[model samples]
Target: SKRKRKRKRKSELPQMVQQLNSPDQQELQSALRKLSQIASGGNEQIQAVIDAGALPALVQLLSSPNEQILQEALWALSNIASGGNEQIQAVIDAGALPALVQLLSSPNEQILQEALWALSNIASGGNEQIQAVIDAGALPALVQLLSSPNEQILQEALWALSNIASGGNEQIQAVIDAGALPALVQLLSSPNEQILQEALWALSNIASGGNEQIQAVIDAGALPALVQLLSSPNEQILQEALWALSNIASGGNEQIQAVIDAGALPALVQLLSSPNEQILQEALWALSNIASGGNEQKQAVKEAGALEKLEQLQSHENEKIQKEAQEALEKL
Candidate 1:
């Protein structure tokens, strides 16, 4: 047992926990900031801090009125969550969820950003913890953060919700029921280019599920935003939006009718003239699906010059484009 004491990584973990436990507010606040910095050092230090019993103390400080203390504590909590599922479980075990979820309602965008980031890490631990967040009512408070003036807050909130949404069916339903659908749909038009992509990602998870999930997003007025994204010069954004649109079109013609009214079909045919090959192929996949729809859709594709565009692709030097181009025209 000499090795246990002899080679123990020297840390003031106990002293730190002691400071955190101190009655003096300054001592606890200062100690929490130091402990938070140490927690980020890595998993070994995280385990040491956990074993030293600093985590539960950290959870207690989550209620600290000082913004600095809240920031440091939330940072440490996120680092601990990043350590993996067991550590995430420990934070939850320390009763961190209620406070962390509550912080999702923090009026300060900076604090809200950190809180959302910390929750993002916990949700990444998977379903059990994912539901733990929802059960705490993180979802209701979460919907408003999507509209925060801070793009960082907006981005992280989207990221957190998307992770929760990916946990499977019930989780997806919770996100929808939380009243986040319209706010999320609205972000599809965010002027901040980064927010636009992140919004698409979250919506993809929602739309990827059953048609009702897609239906919910559609009813939220996502079809317009999604079709607008198809014209994005950012190809990655364009492709993802196209992917969601194709999925939307994959549903019944009522779904296709939404895309048509949103001008999505006309937008995709314009992609037939895309200067980039990858963009061209992604457009092909969507155009083909629209081609598989009813006569109205077929005529819409033809009227958009897609049939003529397909004729142009049929003469392309690349065999993949040429053949698939002909195949799409066959459906039309």
Candidate 2:
């Protein structure tokens, strides 16, 4: 009896794989649903499913006319793609991209959401994979989903775009050229703080690109909006907003002046005493950059009372903060 039980356990994965290859669509869908559940167990389980020759079958199911079958297939593939490089490459190698990209047009919201999740994981892989996603024309579809009323869809699209923006100049500009800037900036006004935070993150990456990209963010009226976010009770929002402003300030004299003119200096000086170390560091870094600018900007920071705080920071316990303070003081 024990040997029989062991044999039955051993037969499970192969049976599922066999069912996946069945001519019966019902059995195939059932197997995919089971595989979707199994894939969520973790990397080892996902690798098990992948090793069972599930990828091609999953990819095939992405085109199934039945919505449930397609959703389950996308969900399973999304989890699989969440693994390491080889796992993601397996999904891609199975022709997952074109099928996943095609499902982006599905009228079913669940299908769209799962497809975005799959593509988002794929984009998060690395530059090569991100380029692959872009090359597959994911940018415009992702950018279009930005306006989706579903918060889940909206957040996932922003996440994918954020990762794209973090890639490099070409990828960052791809997101920008896909019309992400204006759409992203508009989300700053969303009452949902999570949406607002993600929107800020995307914009932050875009701003970090370089002069042209930073200028794109500034020209999009992000300065006024980011300035407003500084007063938020949400420390995360404050930190990201400060970091974005810091990047903008580090861009060039004109950009630095733009941040200062947005009334960031006083808010930044106030942040010098923030209990959050990250906020303190970013605020100090921004002031240091502003101080590194010519006399007027340096004088403006000093006038905002940055010197007193910088002096205090000079003796602080954190060496990095102390170094930033010393450099800022010297520049002052």
Candidate 3:
């Protein structure tokens, strides 16, 4: 039934893409808006629009004097970038990069969001696309936006940084170097789950880096919030916070001790009893990492009775949790 409407939307692509070239500003804006709406239909519809040469027409409008047209162009571009690899690559190849990257500094807050949205989708892809945004000076502008008092921009900026942090070693370093740590750590305490979630996500990537990066998070004094969030009523926050903690402990003895010192053992120990498998599994992973730090750390877990839960888990239904429980036991 959904496919039926999509087919009807498909035949209109070329005409939609063509109207962007109309001389009348009114016609162009309407066409841009129409194409933007059409592109959002689905990836299949996105490809049809791209196949009809929507790429250059859309990129050209990105440079338009009219904010409406520029924003409309961004809507179409982000929708295109949301598609799979080849579909997203079409928008990147259409040369939307420079204009989109430069638009990051737009004084208009809405345009700032539109620019961030486009860059986020483009950067949401691969290393090549990710590096391109960094090269075009998107990092500083993005970092600056993180401090914006507006929750919308703050969350949007965090998301953009989060995607870039996933690119690879240097990509993660790029974000930290853009002075992202302080603001990221600050956002960790946000009452808004959406903001808190993105902050943890971005910090999770940084923790996934190396000793220094994890230490950077520690030095920024984020341990209290990270430790507190380990017991978040919201599982999504718990998940990311736990992920970040596991990576921190994986940095070895000194790092694991830092996590323990910050009171993670109790929260993590509490999580071992979570009814949810992933949370339970992650708790086991974090506990085992601490045990892997040797006797003293394992004893810390032992005194907390966290080690006691492992024996029963060893015979549990989920083999993976069973393995984590056994591995943690071995380390003890």
Best by TM-score: 2
lDDT of 1 by residue, 1-332 (tens): 00000000005678888887677888888888777777787778788878989877788889988777778888888888887678778988899989888787667877878888888888887678889888978888778778778777877888888888767668878999998888888887777778877777777777666667768888989987788888787877997787777767766667777778889877888888877888887788777877777999888888888887898899887788887898898887
TM-score of each: 0.77, 0.88, 0.87
The list of candidate 1 runs beyond 4 A from truth reads 1-15, 22-34, 41-48, 150-152, 250-253, 288-332
Q: Give the TM-score of candidate 3.
A: 0.87
lDDT of each model, Cα atoms only?
Answer: 0.78, 0.81, 0.80
Residue 199 CA displacement from its true place in model 1, Å? 2.9
Q: What lDDT does model 1 reach?
A: 0.78
Output the worst ten-in-a-row residue range by lDDT, candidate 1: 1-10
Per-residue accuracy of model 2 over 1-332 as CA lDDT, tens digit each: 00000000003876787796688988888887888888777778888998789888788877788777777888888888887766777788889998888888888888888888888788777667778888888888888988989898899888778877777768878888888888988999899989998888888878777778888898889999898888888988887787777777777778878988999988888888877778888888778777767888888888999889899998888888988889889988
Supply the global lDDT for candidate 2.
0.81
lDDT of 3 by residue, 135-191 (tens): 878899888888888889888888788888877778878888899999988888888
Candidates by TM-score, descending order: 2, 3, 1
Clashes of 2: 0
How far residue 276's Cα lies from its native spot in candidate 2, in Å, is 3.2
Better of 2 and 3 by TM-score: 2
After superposition, the stretches of candidate 3 with alpha carbons farther than 4 Å from their true spots are 1-16, 42-44, 315-319
